[model samples]
Target: MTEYKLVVVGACGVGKSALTIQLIQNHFVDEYDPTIEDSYRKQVVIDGETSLLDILDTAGQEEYSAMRDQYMRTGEGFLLVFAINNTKSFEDIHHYREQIKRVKDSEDVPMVLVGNKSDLPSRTVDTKQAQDLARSYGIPFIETSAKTRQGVDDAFYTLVREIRKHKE
Candidate 1:
């Protein structure tokens, strides 16, 4: 089975853990933990191919920034996640993207810009703006709600597809 190394990244409180746990466990976590770094493995079928997804649920707090480079170097694809209701988190996507590119030493790395927490009532990050950013990066953009499991699989599957294309 093919294995894809995926890293989830964004600002603090953007629900990185929620999204990862939802995908791996099919459950949502309401409580926020700022100092968490976990790895999960799940065998999934994407595009009719059986593959194992090695997902790294990363810490979003500043103190954990030191660990970013190691994962960025190893990650085959990335989910650049942010909360729809937090404009700062959306803006922080650029920094993560830049860091990933710097660490990977490649601009054409596979990546997906994710707007998480779409179940929230008020969204500060405009969908069009996120779309435009994704376009500028030449990658896919998705809106996801880990609470409702909306777009959760699509987001991760899309990253796998991106990684496949990148390998090609």
Candidate 2:
């Protein structure tokens, strides 16, 4: 079976735990969380190809830290999450990308930029800005909501598709 190691990377307040757990459980929860990283595995097929997905839920806040780079080296694909309501988290996307690219020593690594909490009101991060940033990085961008279960599956699928494309 094809295997992919995907990490949902982000700082606190984003839906990294919430979104990853939802994919694992096949349902939404009132709350789900982790530290360092929590792994979840599943089997699925996309575009007629079967594969195994190992998702790592990773937290970040490190100051020029190795923790993120370490995870980036292990991960073949990434879901870079930012809470739309939290502008600080949105700004960290570039930092995360630099860490990943530095550790991997490649700018062609696969990643999907996720604007999470689409269900939440009063969003500070605009979709236009997020889209522009993703375009500049050449990464797929998607908005997700763990609360309303909107675009959650799309977020994961988009990353998987890109990962497969990158490998091929």
Candidate 3:
């Protein structure tokens, strides 16, 4: 079996958990508690594909700030999720830059820059901004909506393909 580890990363309320919930349950998270209680892991297989994903749903714990760096060490790839409707969440990408760069073989680790919450209009973070940011870091950018499941599969599968190509 082909197994890969993916870290759903970003600051709190950036749609990490929500994306995971969408992937694991195919349901949207309408309301979420601010405090992330615990970290969890799950496995997901893409449609018409042989690759299996081992997703690490990391918590937004203040104490576990360092945990993301550690998790990155184990992850083969990453889904850098940010809410398109929130500028603050988009800004947090630069803050996590240093930590994300510290993972083992970091250059080889594929990352998909995801702008979540595509179901709603009036996005503070535009597609150009997201594309530029991802382009600057040599990663693919995707706009998605967990509520409507738009680009959800694309975001996940894209990273897997990138990771596979990188490892080759």
Task: Choose the strongest candidate by lDDT.
Answer: 1
lDDT scores in order: 0.90, 0.85, 0.77
In the range 1-168, model 2's lDDT, one tens digit per residue, is: 988998887778688888877777867766454344668998877788888998988763556666656766988998989999999999999988887888998768899999999997889999999999999999989999988788888898889999988888
Give each prediction's root-mean-square deviation over alpha carbons: 1.5, 1.9, 2.5
Clashes of each: 0, 0, 0
Candidate 3 error regions (>4 Å): 33-48, 63-68
Q: What lDDT, from 0 to 1, does candidate 1 have?
A: 0.90
Listed in order, each prediction's TM-score against the native is 0.95, 0.91, 0.85
Q: Indicate which candidate wins on TM-score.
A: 1
Residue by residue across 5-79, what tens digits does model 1's lDDT show? 999988888989999999998899998687878899999999998889999988845654556677669899999
Q: Which ranges in model 1 have alpha carbons more than 4 Å from their true place?
A: 60-68
Candidate 2 error regions (>4 Å) = 31-36, 60-71
